[PDB]
């Protein structure tokens, strides 16, 4: 997937898709006020 290798078992349900769908090449994006005292 660009940096590492993903190891996957090819199931019968996987019968139409591309291999590249099963190793995602990007990581999920996982992303206090002034009060006056005087």
């Amino acid at each position: 997937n660009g940096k590492t290798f993903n190891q996957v078992e090819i199931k019968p349900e996987m019968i139409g898709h591309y291999l590249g769908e099963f190793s995602i090449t990007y990581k999920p994006v996982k992303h206090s006020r002034f009060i006056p005292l005087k």
Binding site: T4, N6, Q7, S23
Partner: peptide, 22 residues
Amino acid sequence: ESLQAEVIPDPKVPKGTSSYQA
């Protein structure tokens, strides 16, 4: 009389899933 007290007297992931895609 002073004493010789130099020192102080008190003593859910599949098998092949990489760390990326996990």
